[PDB]
């Protein structure tokens, strides 16, 4: 029987401010509630006095304990009847609830007044959150990293060459690459040493189903603010992505977000804490999207960019019209692959015929399906050629293995590959 669950917006300070506390949630009731006298969560015998409330409040109270202050219940109680009974930072009601989380010990507890039949919900809630809040899990994982004891255990397997099929499955997705966010003009200096200067870049933000390549064009102005830009690249990337996700609706909020650079996952996890439903997918299979930006019109647009702007495109248009998305994506994958091997070769292949013309909207030249097929074959040969040159063993390839080689994703050490192989 709650009329409205409103969040009282406090300063960012509140989170960690300890001398005072404004209430985080304010709870407007339908009827008067008759809350119990203040008590702890596990204190079962909650005494229902004649006092009533038309409005409660919920406060969180994060703490980081020591070997000496490692009980939370006492602390939370103290906090509750400190801030209530203190003439700074008054709550709308003196009757309310206060949760506190010992982050150092994972010892949740809460104290305060209790609406009838509420306590069980809160207990269960806390139990759930502690079991798996995203933010708290991140924190534990962060600490774990700090202590180099990280048990490499994932619930969802990575995108290897086998699971590539099950990438997409009538399911709204998004795909991210942060490779060409921080590009540099290397130019000489008066002293003689090199000076790196930032160029405009991108946030390769693709959707394999629709073929809608979003890419927020990074204007160099955003680097002009700060230094240590390789890390900052990641941060801006994840920030931008997060913002984009926020902008889109709950239906069009993409479920599984895939990331090219596995290092850039780490801050994304943080900026994805805005919304927990958006699962992260660290790809085992490296896809060529550094060379994605070396497509003519894309690079053109990147250079053109004058400000913080995004200019989306359909990475494949005609292909969608002809065939399902997956087919289109295979072709695209081949193309990008070839580009990554060699740009000149790629362009040559594309512009082998000069009679063909790239459509005004489209990023790619519109071919007939048999000539298209031929082109694809040529590209594949290019990739294989590259492999032969560098890897020096492109001749005696098994089928699955060959497929992996095309992507260049299925690594030899990757145990997923062993799995698929084992299966066959």
């Amino acid at each position: 029987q709650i009329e409205s669950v409103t969040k009282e917006t406090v300063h960012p300070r509140k989170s960690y401010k300890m001398n005072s506390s404004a209430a985080d949630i304010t709870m407007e009731s339908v009827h008067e509630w008759e809350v119990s006298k203040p008590s702890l969560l596990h204190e079962t015998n909650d005494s229902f006095k004649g006092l009533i409330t038309n409005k409660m409040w919920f406060d969180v109270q994060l703490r980081y304990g020591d070997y000496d202050s490692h009980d939370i219940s006492r602390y939370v109680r103290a906090k509750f009847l400190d801030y209530t009974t203190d003439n700074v930072s008054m709550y709308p009601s003196p009757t309310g609830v206060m949760i506190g989380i010992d982050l150092a010990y994972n010892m949740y507890d809460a104290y305060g007044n209790w609406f009838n039949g509420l306590k069980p919900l809160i207990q269960n809630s806390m139990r759930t959150i502690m079991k798996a809040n995203p933010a708290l899990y991140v924190l534990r994982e962060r600490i774990r990293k700090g202590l180099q004891i990280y048990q490499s255990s994932v619930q969802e397997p990575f995108l290897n060459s086998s699971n590539y099929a099950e990438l997409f499955n009538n399911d709204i997705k998004l795909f991210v690459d942060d490779t060409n966010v921080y590009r540099v003009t290397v130019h000489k200096t008066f002293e003689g040493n090199v000076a790196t200067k930032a160029i405009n870049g991108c946030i390769f933000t693709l959707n394999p189903k629709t073929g809608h390549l979003f890419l927020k064009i990074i204007h160099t102005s955003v680097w002009a603010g700060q230094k240590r830009l390789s890390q900052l690249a990641k941060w801006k990337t994840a920030e931008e992505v997060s913002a984009l996700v926020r902008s889109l609706p709950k239906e069009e909020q993409p479920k599984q977000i895939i990331v090219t650079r596995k290092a850039m996952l780490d801050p994304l996890e943080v900026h994805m804490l805005d919304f927990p439903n958006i699962a992260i997918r660290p790809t085992e299979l490296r896809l060529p999207f550094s060379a994605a930006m070396s497509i003519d019109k894309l690079s053109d647009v990147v250079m053109k960019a004058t400000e913080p702007q995004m200019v989306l495109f359909n990475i494949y248009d005609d292909w969608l019209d002809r065939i399902s998305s997956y087919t289109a994506f295979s072709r695209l994958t081949l193309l990008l692959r070839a580009l990554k091997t060699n740009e000149e070769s790629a362009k040559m292949i594309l512009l082998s015929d000069p009679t063909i013309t790239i459509k005004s909207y489209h990023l790619w030249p519109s071919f007939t399906d048999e000539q298209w097929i031929t082109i694809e074959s040529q590209m594949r040969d290019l990739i294989l050629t590259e492999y032969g040159r560098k890897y020096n063993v492109n001749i005696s390839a098994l089928t699955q293995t060959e497929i992996k080689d095309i992507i260049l994703g299925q690594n030899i050490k990757a145990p997923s590959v062993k799995r698929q192989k084992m299966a066959e």
Partner: protein
Amino acid sequence: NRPERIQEAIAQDKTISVIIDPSQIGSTKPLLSMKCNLYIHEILSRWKASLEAYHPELFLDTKKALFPLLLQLRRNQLAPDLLISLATVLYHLQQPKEINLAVQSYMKLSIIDERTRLWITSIKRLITFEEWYTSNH
């Protein structure tokens, strides 16, 4: 009192050209506002037909998200920086061959922000439906 607010408004609701001039953005205000405000009402009505085909659950709250705009637009509470970006989205949304330009314009609109997100996000559903609506037709 309230009856003449029904009469004058519903009469005015059926009295408009559902058009956005791409050059009148440069001019200074209620004309572009109410053009867009009642163009959105057509985007609402085209939805109202194929509510059985499309998923209706999100629209029921889309309505409540749109209610701010209605209150903004007929008053001109909505800011010039928002409005120029907003009308730019709706103009490109008119032509079926500006679907790139539609979401293009929406992304540059999005890029204090609590219900503004909610309604601006709701506008993306209006593009999402309209883009699909013209496809499945």
